């Protein structure tokens, strides 16, 4: 369906992200049989909502819970919403959630990171109080988008196992909200920006009205009409542009309007006039070679898990600003739009990624049998339905983010095993579909290291080569000398094989804050510096390398294991955002370069 | 003035705590002169708002900034607030704030932990947007509630000095909002709940209205009318009840109804049926010998400072609950109301405290530079204005929390130096006025240790004896063997002198998380455990001691100094809420007792 971020013009939001809701588990899964959405959640406890439910209660049982949980709260409908289209919207409900407005089911959704909404007008009376019950499921299987395997022992007690690194946090991670629109209302927009060697060109507009005549107009930062248009679906505006630039991110405003014989609708969409294209080994932005620096990030912090927070966001962007990072990838799932809005406004360049991580049965900490399917691409494991769900995930992401200028490329997935035979058969259609859905952005699929230049089967189907490389860590452990020979050899292989622009989208080493060593070995702050330093020497020798995104700006939680010391420690910053010495290393290299430009080969 | 916690039926809130305001510093203090509230803040940046401005940007020059900062924001006013009361309310603006609606100065407030509000109807138009500018000041001087001394050096820059331990966080710490009201509006309510010997008794209701007849109806949790009152002036509803007990905390809902011939105003007030008093050497909640357990706390956390957070609140309470804490103190300032709303609902007992802290001038080892007034109570320093401002502080807090059943006691001040001359003539009037503001709750002043039995001039004026003691820490450094003698010798010296209930409001020791020592010495977890043990042993032998609160629940930030290792480390939990070995020690002692019941000497 159509998706537009709610703003407040003839429209209005009652946030209802207002924190406190009632909360209780369903350990027996009799919540639907007993119709819990019909009565006050019995035996419930307070919970904060935008957030993960796992960490809020310092309870291991609640944290490791698999299955259904229930949220609930009563809210008032603004009396002034008398005759309006009243919509209930969840910016995210991790993995699955079903919604009842007082014994009337309105929604159902299967993906944890994108919004779903429903017209609740016929089920809400303006000025009264309603009972909103959400049932949330945090289970993964071979058709869910991060694939997964829910294991159930002889006792019936379920247990979630997955193939990605980060912890499987669940719950309502983002805002829920009631919002208003007139019965004639803009409900879908699509803007393509074009540019021709930086003096003028056009923005195609494509508008889906909920039954109205649409007019449109483009406004400066100082709010003046620089262009104007009429008609529905089709338009091309022409300009003398202030281009959206990685540095500043100048934004115009396209004000879309929907007119009945009786009702108006005004929707302002921030627009960034910029071109994103690949030419050979280069990633051109506004027809200029751009060099990515920054992080693979995560949505993760103490207490709130993947729950959104404005302070966290403000702080992290201050940090990424200080350190000199010009980019990042929404590591492994669509991030909260607030992030993309920030990126739009501050000129931050983003690699937007689906939640499609886990395709791989070969990332294992060995020697626990842990029978996984023997065929990755097979009816048991990654099958036709999976491909659909995957396709669906791509659709829902693009539908949401197609208009963000900050997004400079789509990432279909992260580290699938591309060796097995069905790999190319599974991904080819997804690469073609993605291009259909958005023709205006280069496409990528993040590559795991054991599917190297000689064994990978998929990378030619994409535009930019995004590599996850750990030479000197998981392999050639603690050996910088040989890791460097391999890294550079593998990069040159990829260069000559595909002649695409290479971005190292992951490189980093677990590092204990405060672990110092004269011998500069693996888990020490000094090693993290020596490692990163070595990678950088290599990158500056390889012309096709067009980007470097360190594996993790900050330590994050993972599933328990012998590889993970209370989580992943590849953070440049700790989880409470305190900088390891590598932070200062990067700030020198990144602030030291000419902005958005690859280093001549040496200082 | 009149303060009511906004709730939602004939009233509606659009929370302006939509994080992301415009923010800037005014290092030239020329914003007021240049009328910054008239246009958009130039040289601004996004800031999340609830929460301190200090830490959001990982910047020292902003963290330590003293002077004025500016918050700005725009907000559409709801169409449905057609001809209604529109009230702009800030739950807190640390220290000072001046507010402008577009160009209209609508507000001004000194005090940082209590709300203020005003009617903005004439300056706002429903259906339109309005610009909101807030000038926030963090400066502290002698006539301020947290007293202090700002020193402008030869250069044009200010540098704040103060006398309390915790860091001087500032900014908009709590919810800000627009909330609506009919023109006939309840604007004040006061409730006193008398009980006697636990079979039955009534509640006086007394309230102020904007011209409306009041239908006062008391309700079950089940919404059944268990009593009814009549008349805009008060009542006595004498029925047999369900007591608000510390264990579970039952709650009645007294609905207050104001009426005009044209408009009707409904307001639900949470009412906890309980009595509180001092009887000899006992604290009697519902006529029961109680025993306080818990912490002295602080509004403090990573990144956000003293800014409120639902997750943080949900988690901390999960901890206190788990560890066995049945009570705590709003240490050194009025906390956000949510904390008390939560305490009411969960039967959490709460010693409410004013921001009166810093009244003392001998409070450290200063190696550093002379002049700091000579006479604490003197026109130089703590004087007429300062007793006024102090009174004003007692007023506002009580005007807000007089109806919170969790509040079982008022704390006038913290660690005042009561040896100088004016000490007794200063606190006597305030001690008198407080009871005159609320005679339903006992009152205390938290005592510093160098005012001890033979030297404190001011304890007799209060009902309960609250003592901060570090006998094994600041003095008798690391000698549990003598620290015991002194402590008991001291406690028994207090008992015989005043014959009041004794609560140790502060007892704890700095402890580096992860510092272990076979020698069980200072700043080691082992020591912290041994120290707290030693105290418990002494409490267990003084029949007068009715309450124990460990020093801080969690490590927090302080001003820079030799005694503060990256902040006060006296937390039982670290700042990110990870427990020190003392947590499990307290766990066993606290949950191990009978609820609200002192051990039988020993145990
Ligand atoms: C050349 C080669 C061959 C085999 C490999 N196998 C691996 O597992 C990994 C680690 N992998 C990171 C991959 O980039 C990870 O994320 N691991 C993980 C997570 C949860 C449980 C157990 C786990 F090992 C690297 C790897 C490299
Ligand atoms: C018997 C005696 C005599 C003199 C003393 N002087 C002190 O300072 C303290 C410490 N005090 C806690 C009081 O309970 C504190 O809060 N200190 C502080 C804070 C910031 C900077 C420097 C600082 F010393 C105790 C104390 C005891």
PDB file of C-alpha atoms in Angstrom, chain B residues 202-361:
ATOM      1  CA  UNK B 202     -13.274   9.763  55.564  1.00  0.00           C
ATOM      2  CA  UNK B 203     -11.610  12.241  53.225  1.00  0.00           C
ATOM      3  CA  UNK B 204     -11.854  16.017  53.185  1.00  0.00           C
ATOM      4  CA  UNK B 205     -12.155  17.403  49.669  1.00  0.00           C
ATOM      5  CA  UNK B 206     -11.558  21.099  49.061  1.00  0.00           C
ATOM      6  CA  UNK B 207     -11.118  22.764  45.693  1.00  0.00           C
ATOM      7  CA  UNK B 208     -11.088  25.989  43.662  1.00  0.00           C
ATOM      8  CA  UNK B 209     -13.152  26.480  40.502  1.00  0.00           C
ATOM      9  CA  UNK B 210     -13.671  29.043  37.734  1.00  0.00           C
ATOM     10  CA  UNK B 211     -17.359  29.546  38.524  1.00  0.00           C
ATOM     11  CA  UNK B 212     -18.694  25.993  38.642  1.00  0.00           C
ATOM     12  CA  UNK B 213     -20.762  23.867  41.001  1.00  0.00           C
ATOM     13  CA  UNK B 214     -18.812  20.740  41.901  1.00  0.00           C
ATOM     14  CA  UNK B 215     -20.121  17.180  41.919  1.00  0.00           C
ATOM     15  CA  UNK B 216     -17.453  15.253  43.814  1.00  0.00           C
ATOM     16  CA  UNK B 217     -17.735  11.478  43.429  1.00  0.00           C
ATOM     17  CA  UNK B 218     -15.329   8.915  44.879  1.00  0.00           C
ATOM     18  CA  UNK B 219     -14.859   5.630  43.020  1.00  0.00           C
ATOM     19  CA  UNK B 220     -13.608   2.099  43.359  1.00  0.00           C
ATOM     20  CA  UNK B 221     -10.907   0.803  41.101  1.00  0.00           C
ATOM     21  CA  UNK B 222     -13.975  -0.778  39.523  1.00  0.00           C
ATOM     22  CA  UNK B 223     -15.451   2.656  38.793  1.00  0.00           C
ATOM     23  CA  UNK B 224     -18.337   2.241  41.245  1.00  0.00           C
ATOM     24  CA  UNK B 225     -19.571   5.268  43.186  1.00  0.00           C
ATOM     25  CA  UNK B 226     -18.685   4.326  46.766  1.00  0.00           C
ATOM     26  CA  UNK B 227     -19.453   7.862  48.006  1.00  0.00           C
ATOM     27  CA  UNK B 228     -20.588  11.266  46.747  1.00  0.00           C
ATOM     28  CA  UNK B 229     -19.912  14.805  47.909  1.00  0.00           C
ATOM     29  CA  UNK B 230     -21.561  18.133  47.183  1.00  0.00           C
ATOM     30  CA  UNK B 231     -20.599  21.797  47.043  1.00  0.00           C
ATOM     31  CA  UNK B 232     -17.646  23.672  45.577  1.00  0.00           C
ATOM     32  CA  UNK B 233     -16.314  23.987  49.136  1.00  0.00           C
ATOM     33  CA  UNK B 234     -15.495  20.768  50.989  1.00  0.00           C
ATOM     34  CA  UNK B 235     -16.834  17.475  52.335  1.00  0.00           C
ATOM     35  CA  UNK B 236     -16.244  14.400  54.513  1.00  0.00           C
ATOM     36  CA  UNK B 237     -17.158  11.071  52.879  1.00  0.00           C
ATOM     37  CA  UNK B 238     -17.140   8.611  55.784  1.00  0.00           C
ATOM     38  CA  UNK B 239     -17.106   5.072  54.370  1.00  0.00           C
ATOM     39  CA  UNK B 240     -15.290   1.819  55.177  1.00  0.00           C
ATOM     40  CA  UNK B 241     -12.302   1.552  52.806  1.00  0.00           C
ATOM     41  CA  UNK B 242      -9.480  -0.390  51.168  1.00  0.00           C
ATOM     42  CA  UNK B 243      -6.263   1.054  52.562  1.00  0.00           C
ATOM     43  CA  UNK B 244      -3.441   2.476  50.460  1.00  0.00           C
ATOM     44  CA  UNK B 245      -0.696   0.201  51.779  1.00  0.00           C
ATOM     45  CA  UNK B 246       3.046   0.171  50.974  1.00  0.00           C
ATOM     46  CA  UNK B 247       2.709  -3.462  49.877  1.00  0.00           C
ATOM     47  CA  UNK B 248       0.270  -2.985  46.998  1.00  0.00           C
ATOM     48  CA  UNK B 249      -1.189   0.532  47.176  1.00  0.00           C
ATOM     49  CA  UNK B 250      -4.924   0.489  46.431  1.00  0.00           C
ATOM     50  CA  UNK B 251      -6.237   3.615  44.693  1.00  0.00           C
ATOM     51  CA  UNK B 252      -9.587   5.372  44.668  1.00  0.00           C
ATOM     52  CA  UNK B 253     -10.539   7.812  41.918  1.00  0.00           C
ATOM     53  CA  UNK B 254     -12.161  11.006  43.149  1.00  0.00           C
ATOM     54  CA  UNK B 255     -13.794  12.570  40.103  1.00  0.00           C
ATOM     55  CA  UNK B 256     -14.201  16.350  40.378  1.00  0.00           C
ATOM     56  CA  UNK B 257     -16.914  18.015  38.298  1.00  0.00           C
ATOM     57  CA  UNK B 258     -17.248  21.769  37.701  1.00  0.00           C
ATOM     58  CA  UNK B 259     -20.351  23.184  36.018  1.00  0.00           C
ATOM     59  CA  UNK B 260     -21.524  26.269  34.175  1.00  0.00           C
ATOM     60  CA  UNK B 261     -24.867  26.589  32.398  1.00  0.00           C
ATOM     61  CA  UNK B 262     -22.853  26.183  29.196  1.00  0.00           C
ATOM     62  CA  UNK B 263     -19.760  24.075  29.900  1.00  0.00           C
ATOM     63  CA  UNK B 264     -18.924  21.069  32.080  1.00  0.00           C
ATOM     64  CA  UNK B 265     -15.446  20.132  33.333  1.00  0.00           C
ATOM     65  CA  UNK B 266     -14.480  16.651  34.526  1.00  0.00           C
ATOM     66  CA  UNK B 267     -11.255  15.876  36.403  1.00  0.00           C
ATOM     67  CA  UNK B 268     -10.163  12.509  37.918  1.00  0.00           C
ATOM     68  CA  UNK B 269      -7.785  12.665  40.883  1.00  0.00           C
ATOM     69  CA  UNK B 270      -5.817   9.674  42.131  1.00  0.00           C
ATOM     70  CA  UNK B 271      -6.545   9.359  45.846  1.00  0.00           C
ATOM     71  CA  UNK B 272      -4.717   7.000  48.181  1.00  0.00           C
ATOM     72  CA  UNK B 273      -6.516   6.370  51.460  1.00  0.00           C
ATOM     73  CA  UNK B 274      -3.755   6.513  54.086  1.00  0.00           C
ATOM     74  CA  UNK B 275      -2.572   8.315  57.218  1.00  0.00           C
ATOM     75  CA  UNK B 276       0.946   9.373  58.151  1.00  0.00           C
ATOM     76  CA  UNK B 277       2.286  10.580  61.503  1.00  0.00           C
ATOM     77  CA  UNK B 278       5.082  10.407  64.069  1.00  0.00           C
ATOM     78  CA  UNK B 279       4.374   8.568  67.326  1.00  0.00           C
ATOM     79  CA  UNK B 280       7.286   8.544  69.760  1.00  0.00           C
ATOM     80  CA  UNK B 281      10.145   6.921  67.859  1.00  0.00           C
ATOM     81  CA  UNK B 282       8.040   5.363  65.115  1.00  0.00           C
ATOM     82  CA  UNK B 283       6.854   6.269  61.642  1.00  0.00           C
ATOM     83  CA  UNK B 284       3.228   5.193  61.328  1.00  0.00           C
ATOM     84  CA  UNK B 285       1.750   4.723  57.873  1.00  0.00           C
ATOM     85  CA  UNK B 286      -1.834   3.713  58.574  1.00  0.00           C
ATOM     86  CA  UNK B 287      -0.857   3.431  62.226  1.00  0.00           C
ATOM     87  CA  UNK B 288       1.843   0.836  61.566  1.00  0.00           C
ATOM     88  CA  UNK B 289       5.481   0.716  62.772  1.00  0.00           C
ATOM     89  CA  UNK B 290       7.188   0.994  59.386  1.00  0.00           C
ATOM     90  CA  UNK B 291      10.760   0.463  58.272  1.00  0.00           C
ATOM     91  CA  UNK B 292      12.190   2.363  55.313  1.00  0.00           C
ATOM     92  CA  UNK B 293      14.433   0.570  52.859  1.00  0.00           C
ATOM     93  CA  UNK B 294      15.770   1.862  49.584  1.00  0.00           C
ATOM     94  CA  UNK B 295      17.963   4.577  48.175  1.00  0.00           C
ATOM     95  CA  UNK B 296      18.723   8.214  47.826  1.00  0.00           C
ATOM     96  CA  UNK B 297      18.317   8.726  44.101  1.00  0.00           C
ATOM     97  CA  UNK B 298      19.145  11.175  41.358  1.00  0.00           C
ATOM     98  CA  UNK B 299      17.618  12.151  38.054  1.00  0.00           C
ATOM     99  CA  UNK B 300      20.724  11.249  36.079  1.00  0.00           C
ATOM    100  CA  UNK B 301      21.600   8.936  33.192  1.00  0.00           C
ATOM    101  CA  UNK B 302      23.931   8.721  30.189  1.00  0.00           C
ATOM    102  CA  UNK B 303      23.474  11.277  27.397  1.00  0.00           C
ATOM    103  CA  UNK B 304      20.200  12.795  28.646  1.00  0.00           C
ATOM    104  CA  UNK B 305      21.369  14.094  32.016  1.00  0.00           C
ATOM    105  CA  UNK B 306      18.450  14.835  34.317  1.00  0.00           C
ATOM    106  CA  UNK B 307      15.956  14.514  31.480  1.00  0.00           C
ATOM    107  CA  UNK B 308      13.024  12.220  32.139  1.00  0.00           C
ATOM    108  CA  UNK B 309      12.737   8.859  30.370  1.00  0.00           C
ATOM    109  CA  UNK B 310      10.000   6.217  30.555  1.00  0.00           C
ATOM    110  CA  UNK B 311      12.389   3.352  29.801  1.00  0.00           C
ATOM    111  CA  UNK B 312      14.825   4.502  32.460  1.00  0.00           C
ATOM    112  CA  UNK B 313      11.918   4.787  34.883  1.00  0.00           C
ATOM    113  CA  UNK B 314      10.471   1.401  33.953  1.00  0.00           C
ATOM    114  CA  UNK B 315      13.886  -0.209  34.418  1.00  0.00           C
ATOM    115  CA  UNK B 316      15.059   1.477  37.637  1.00  0.00           C
ATOM    116  CA  UNK B 317      11.770   0.556  39.301  1.00  0.00           C
ATOM    117  CA  UNK B 318      12.169  -3.004  38.087  1.00  0.00           C
ATOM    118  CA  UNK B 319      15.493  -2.899  39.928  1.00  0.00           C
ATOM    119  CA  UNK B 320      14.304  -1.272  43.162  1.00  0.00           C
ATOM    120  CA  UNK B 321      11.397  -3.696  43.165  1.00  0.00           C
ATOM    121  CA  UNK B 322      13.767  -6.628  42.663  1.00  0.00           C
ATOM    122  CA  UNK B 323      16.362  -5.532  45.211  1.00  0.00           C
ATOM    123  CA  UNK B 324      13.784  -4.999  47.953  1.00  0.00           C
ATOM    124  CA  UNK B 325      13.561  -1.213  48.168  1.00  0.00           C
ATOM    125  CA  UNK B 326      10.199  -0.125  49.556  1.00  0.00           C
ATOM    126  CA  UNK B 327      10.980   3.591  49.539  1.00  0.00           C
ATOM    127  CA  UNK B 328      13.261   6.381  48.386  1.00  0.00           C
ATOM    128  CA  UNK B 329      13.944  10.117  48.494  1.00  0.00           C
ATOM    129  CA  UNK B 330      13.709  12.703  45.721  1.00  0.00           C
ATOM    130  CA  UNK B 331      17.336  13.515  46.498  1.00  0.00           C
ATOM    131  CA  UNK B 332      17.991  17.223  46.357  1.00  0.00           C
ATOM    132  CA  UNK B 333      15.215  18.278  43.994  1.00  0.00           C
ATOM    133  CA  UNK B 334      11.608  17.628  43.056  1.00  0.00           C
ATOM    134  CA  UNK B 335      11.565  14.688  40.658  1.00  0.00           C
ATOM    135  CA  UNK B 336       9.284  14.424  37.635  1.00  0.00           C
ATOM    136  CA  UNK B 337       5.654  13.764  38.647  1.00  0.00           C
ATOM    137  CA  UNK B 338       5.644  10.460  36.752  1.00  0.00           C
ATOM    138  CA  UNK B 339       7.827   9.044  39.523  1.00  0.00           C
ATOM    139  CA  UNK B 340       5.187   9.850  42.128  1.00  0.00           C
ATOM    140  CA  UNK B 341       2.331   8.746  39.871  1.00  0.00           C
ATOM    141  CA  UNK B 342       4.243   5.457  39.653  1.00  0.00           C
ATOM    142  CA  UNK B 343       4.891   5.374  43.386  1.00  0.00           C
ATOM    143  CA  UNK B 344       1.209   5.971  44.144  1.00  0.00           C
ATOM    144  CA  UNK B 345       0.211   3.159  41.802  1.00  0.00           C
ATOM    145  CA  UNK B 346       2.809   0.713  43.130  1.00  0.00           C
ATOM    146  CA  UNK B 347       2.661   1.612  46.820  1.00  0.00           C
ATOM    147  CA  UNK B 348       6.179   3.011  46.743  1.00  0.00           C
ATOM    148  CA  UNK B 349       6.841   5.177  49.809  1.00  0.00           C
ATOM    149  CA  UNK B 350       8.494   8.500  48.967  1.00  0.00           C
ATOM    150  CA  UNK B 351      10.301  11.117  51.047  1.00  0.00           C
ATOM    151  CA  UNK B 352       9.788  14.206  48.869  1.00  0.00           C
ATOM    152  CA  UNK B 353      12.635  16.751  48.962  1.00  0.00           C
ATOM    153  CA  UNK B 354      13.146  20.358  47.840  1.00  0.00           C
ATOM    154  CA  UNK B 355      16.152  21.510  45.831  1.00  0.00           C
ATOM    155  CA  UNK B 356      17.381  23.230  49.015  1.00  0.00           C
ATOM    156  CA  UNK B 357      20.885  21.768  48.950  1.00  0.00           C
ATOM    157  CA  UNK B 358      24.157  23.686  49.178  1.00  0.00           C
ATOM    158  CA  UNK B 359      23.214  25.742  52.239  1.00  0.00           C
ATOM    159  CA  UNK B 360      26.579  24.691  53.614  1.00  0.00           C
ATOM    160  CA  UNK B 361      30.005  26.181  53.048  1.00  0.00           C
TER     161      UNK B 361
END
